[PDB]
Symmetry: D2
Subunit: 372 residues, 4 copies
Amino acid sequence: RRTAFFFDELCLWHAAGPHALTLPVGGWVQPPAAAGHAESPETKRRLKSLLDVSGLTARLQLRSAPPASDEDLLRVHPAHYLERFKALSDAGGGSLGQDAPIGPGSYEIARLSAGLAIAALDAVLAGEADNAYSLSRPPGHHCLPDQAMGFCFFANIAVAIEAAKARHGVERVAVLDWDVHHGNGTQAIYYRRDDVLSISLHQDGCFPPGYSGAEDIGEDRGRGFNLNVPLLPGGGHDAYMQAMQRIVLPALERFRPQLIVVASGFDANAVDPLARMQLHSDSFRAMTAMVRDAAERHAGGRLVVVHEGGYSEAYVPFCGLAVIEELSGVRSAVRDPLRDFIELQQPNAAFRDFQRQRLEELAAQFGLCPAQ
Amino acid sequence: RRTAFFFDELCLWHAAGPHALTLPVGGWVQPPAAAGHAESPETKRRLKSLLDVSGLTARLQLRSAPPASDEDLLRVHPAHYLERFKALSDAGGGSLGQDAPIGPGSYEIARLSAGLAIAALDAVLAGEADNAYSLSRPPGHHCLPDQAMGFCFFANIAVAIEAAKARHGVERVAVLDWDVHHGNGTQAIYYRRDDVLSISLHQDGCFPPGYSGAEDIGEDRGRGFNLNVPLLPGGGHDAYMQAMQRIVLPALERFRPQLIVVASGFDANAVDPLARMQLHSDSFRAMTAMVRDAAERHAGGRLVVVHEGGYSEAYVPFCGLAVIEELSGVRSAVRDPLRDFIELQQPNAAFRDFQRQRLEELAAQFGLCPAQPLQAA
Amino acid sequence: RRTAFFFDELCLWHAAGPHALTLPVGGWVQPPAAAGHAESPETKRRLKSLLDVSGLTARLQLRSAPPASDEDLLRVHPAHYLERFKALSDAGGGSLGQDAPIGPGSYEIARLSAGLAIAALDAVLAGEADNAYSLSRPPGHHCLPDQAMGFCFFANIAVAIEAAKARHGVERVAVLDWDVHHGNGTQAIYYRRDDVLSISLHQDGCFPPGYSGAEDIGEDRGRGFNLNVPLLPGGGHDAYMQAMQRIVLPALERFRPQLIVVASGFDANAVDPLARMQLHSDSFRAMTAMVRDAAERHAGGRLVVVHEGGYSEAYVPFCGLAVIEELSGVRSAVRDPLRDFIELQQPNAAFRDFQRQRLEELAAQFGLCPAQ
Amino acid sequence: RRTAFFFDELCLWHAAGPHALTLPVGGWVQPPAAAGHAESPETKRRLKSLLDVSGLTARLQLRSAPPASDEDLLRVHPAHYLERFKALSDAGGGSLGQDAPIGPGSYEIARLSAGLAIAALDAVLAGEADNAYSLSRPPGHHCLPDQAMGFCFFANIAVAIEAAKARHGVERVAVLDWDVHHGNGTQAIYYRRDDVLSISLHQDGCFPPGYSGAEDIGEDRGRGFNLNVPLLPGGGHDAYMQAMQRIVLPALERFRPQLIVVASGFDANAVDPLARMQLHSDSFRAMTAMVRDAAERHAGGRLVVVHEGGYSEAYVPFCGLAVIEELSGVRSAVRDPLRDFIELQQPNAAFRDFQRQRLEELAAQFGLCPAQPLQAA
Ligand SMILES: [K+]
Ligand SMILES: [K+]
Ligand SMILES: [K+]
Ligand SMILES: [K+]
Ligand SMILES: [K+]
Ligand SMILES: [K+]
Ligand SMILES: [K+]
Ligand SMILES: [K+]
Ligand SMILES: [Zn+2]
Ligand SMILES: [Zn+2]
Ligand SMILES: [Zn+2]
Ligand SMILES: [Zn+2]
């Protein structure tokens, strides 16, 4: 398999003002001696370094892209949003929204981040590669058209899909969002649309806080083309396998996508500070294998994975590597040193049974229960 | 209330070799640009800084202590363990066990950490203070007599309890361990003993990995004097409140402690990388309030809180502050900026009902009668 | 000796936006993975920690102070400067001047920094202590009345001296500034004054860049009451001993101070990134011993040392400890592990002779040559 | 011009135990909250990132290489040194010598660092490239055959030169070492040899501490084929230009090198914590321009630059970029934001005159005639 890896070093130069994890410095929050904001360059940089040291980089088709044009950005965001962002970026940064801090030059880097997503979809639709991975930072799946949130400043995936519709005329795109938080940006933009099926697996009530959303299935022309799977906090490998087999694959089977796009955050990993789930690198490998199979059956193999969250410096690189190995069909020498440990921590039989029953009920609510 | 705060700046200078969270650097684990080992000084240091800027430190009895003597340490650890640790500490550090890396000078700093625990028990038993908090790093609750594990190198609480029995002759001590991980060191040392009741609240299967332990209730003379409460991963405030009121308080009521020691890790907080629970600073405030009340009813107020885990630099300081406010009866100006957010993330009604039923069954399995707090005559 | 140590934990919570050493992030300057701005909390924090671990803290009179009032600040800075600073502080920070970046809450912390200086002078003038040390961050000696510079936001020492003149009526204050950079704020404010002798030892041309200033000796009523000693870059222990014996002590002898204030930066140390001098901890011990002796001979022992620069995390704590040991007359167990190494690096005989001749000429220019 | 850039990401993963700048943690040296050892990955990594965002990397021949073989390493180091290093590397690291701390896996990464130097010489001798830059970390110029020192564990350049003599039979190699510290490893190995001219520009007495070395000009067969230029501390751009034109170029002209290797440390930059010199990125650009010209006149353009020291995270990337622009003949968009500021800090006329006179006397002491650049026939 021919996998394109879209990456630009400048995406690792985006940096907010001083934060302790997600907490802006000031008042009772002391400036950190070392760390900084949870969305730090180093998580993404360490994925890139492990790809290089593993030699996977040599087996990929390495590519960059021009930044997103105004035309592409304006298909989803208003001009005054672009101005406000630009102005705040030139004045050293600050807070652009709710949990949406930016640094100096963040505007140009966010444009580049959106450009990589655009180019990755384009490459896979033009037949330049069988599938693709876009290491775009800052992420996109929380961003609303006129509102930055959750560390996201442009709706990278939506911007990329609208650019793909204009240039190629792809009619049916599925967005599977396994970032551990709710993909509310993507949900909102495509809520009354049937040309995009948006599916979000997420920790129930995590982010946005208190939101589950099982009953929000889309509206009018979009009714039945948005699916939320609020997994109980503490869930791990089995919960996600169960969700994939009962909800996600049946839903994709029904929808018949011509292109699958994955909002791939790795913040469901077992050591992430920003969620409470218990995935290991083989979970992400297994999920990628399942969605790639769906892409091969319906979409001519056309699958793009766009990097979103993941806030464990130590463990995100192994999770990301697992996805890219699975995308490319190349198994590197890297062994995940936390995998066997995380297997031992999984939910017991009773908790697994409890979550499994909830997913059976949910699959029944969505009218996805087999039979076939 | 008169609260002693046992602290020494040197405890913040203990530092392992390069690690990425818990992963030793080498092989496929790249060295971190900034951070380092998850048991970093900065979590504890930021607690101490917040105590200082909040004004709480001025209202406490700030105290240090001499390091633990050989005699005190030898009551639990063998001489050859002390020698091996000493030797590795003098040769720049290395791995002393399973998830037990040490740095240069770690031996002397671990002795100091144990000394603060010893002194904090001593101060509360001598009536020098009503209660105490010991900011002892490195922690202790995983350490076995001849095996360092879980970032722990001496069994701080066991060393402190044995020193307290020698000096004061206290007959019944309860150890409540609400660090999110299983307090296996304390469990093992006191497993056939009825003079120490060890209770561990912990995430089922977290650390040590795969261990739940509900059926391990102690053996022979110690049968019924060890209780494990394996809470389901993802649990938060209600799960813990429920465990406290159905298991912990009934168990303490039956045991009639003359001293309560809390192994207080803050790694059950909702943003900790090393567990999956969802506590906020008011959870820890509420737990401290309940155990302080038990100490006042049975133990003449005698309560000591010994710092164990907690690996979120940003949030541990607010959790630690909550406990110390509750210990001292002083409310500072500090407002927890994550409290309201974490409240919105809690388990839904169905998951809370599920965990609650498991605790009811567990309380029944331990033969615990749901009696309610009353004073001992 | 009874030494007061003025310190507040909140001074360590001041933090600028992202910088690589002195370079604001943006353009070609990548955000640092770890470090940050060169004026970081950790240099000062590590001095405080070493004081605690050495047990020196137990031998000092530990004290804090209220923040500087508007009245005290307004004796040197205009109200609109206070407003502008405040407003920028409330809007998350930014650039307040030339090499003068601030963070959120920096206004309140700078007020506290000025308050510690005020209180330290007050304590020594009121006879509460024999001498004092103020660990005030952010520093002050570069700040002009209407212009923040060199990481300084209020003229801490000038604010403290004017507060001391109002409350006690001290008539003659000497300011010895051995921070490695030029104390241009103090120079400017007292340039036409004979009630304050300002002496600056500094690396020739370092900061402000290109400035030597030997010929700037004060003007009108202040003529002869400002002395600049531009030491050649690369100079170390002997250069400074030579300057102290030929210029500084004679100058103090002539002036007859009732109070000596030292702007004590430790950035002349041999491993500082922001200068090129080669001092070790015994140099600072020796300089403190000399100025304390002058204070005992003229000023009834009244000496205050106010912390200014110093940007080596590793080495500043040993230099600071040396001064405080000398102030208090208490020798701790701490051994400087770099002292013997730095001794071996000192300028050779020929370079020492060259610098010594330049200081003889300079002492002659100032009309300080012995004789007696 | 065709410039090979020898680089491997694994060279950035070498990491010693906890240090505060050069000071091992322990005793009175508190562990750093953030930074670590002064020889940190980030200085080199930020050079590589700036090369990438400037667009320079796209215009270079980016290349890696296999690690140095045992055969290559054994040409300079003894087997027991390799074994001791290997063993300490496998046991989590420690101190291999005087200012020579290693981490876990440091043995394999040091082999790779030496391999890049070997390959970079090989590529330029085989005509695969006109010149080359090897970003080899950890560095080499302090390492003696049986003694690691100054953060160096193998004698990268010596290992590379001996491998080049075996494979190609090159007869005359010049090593110009403008790392700010004395290149004592290279000096010692080639001290009685006339096939290698070693020149070190260095701050008088810096590292090794107290060493100047002007009278150490080599011995017997090597007499006149080692030159030390101890520049006064505080010197900047003019001092170095003056040394290049009065000592270095005359010396190279006399020697007639068939290959020039530069031990390129950037720690003479004006903000380095580990020295006291005042270079800016144009200084390094000017030095590279002069040595490239010498290589074109004598050595058919054959020049290799091997990265050694440089400990300013903020400023080293701009200095490194300047050299690579000069090596390749490509000027990027990058503007050095510290250049104009550093120009204003330079030594005054009197101090420049003083240093210049010392270099005139030194050139006379070496018996160096001030001939000017001409082509070899
Ligand atoms: K999601
Ligand atoms: K939809
Ligand atoms: K526990
Ligand atoms: K027991
Ligand atoms: K000065
Ligand atoms: K004056
Ligand atoms: K050199
Ligand atoms: K030679
Ligand atoms: Zn997320
Ligand atoms: Zn724990
Ligand atoms: Zn300074
Ligand atoms: Zn060097």
